[PDB]
Amino acid sequence: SNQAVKQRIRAIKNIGKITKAMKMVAASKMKNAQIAVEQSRGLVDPFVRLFGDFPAVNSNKSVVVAVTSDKGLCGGLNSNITKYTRATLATTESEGKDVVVVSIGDKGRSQLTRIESQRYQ
């Protein structure tokens, strides 16, 4: 009776040690991987300067990729672009065209094969 609340306190106390360690693990990773993202932002600039940026084009075939995460403690990231996938997928496909849906990251292969399974290759 009184020990069940005592060792449940032991459960939540070191979960507060796990998720405080995990937050600094993700903060160190975000710090060193921030400079790699600043570098790769340069090379995408000459191509939209040259080829433009035409999202609302009429195609017969289109490959949509959804770049999700792999481990899933990210909390509202991989679900948010699967909302933004179908918000972008359905607004561009009304011509009766073919669509291949790809996902990078296996949190999408758990999330997109049930909302778009017919077009997931």
């Binding site: 292969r109 094969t113 399974s117 017919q118 997931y120 290759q121």
Partner: protein
């Protein structure tokens, strides 16, 4: 079958050609600088063809020596 440059008529895409030339530049660097070469050369991912919407397939790559210069 096709036409174009020498890589394109050999079935080699441009991204594989320009990566084969890319790591071949990285192989001849100085050893303080060649240490930073196989970091950005290693390919570590896996793929799975979803032919059905039901299950996957295979094909996993653990290449730390760059893009495959062999046929594909």
């Amino acid at each position: 079958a096709p036409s174009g440059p020498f890589y394109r008529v050999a079935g080699m895409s441009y991204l594989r050609y320009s990566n084969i030339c890319a790591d071949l530049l990285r192989n001849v660097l100085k050893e303080p600088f060649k240490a930073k070469a196989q970091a950005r050369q290693a390919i570590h991912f896996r793929q799975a063809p979803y032919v059905d919407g039901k299950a996957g397939a295979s094909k996993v790559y653990e290449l730390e020596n760059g893009i495959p210069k062999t046929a594909n």
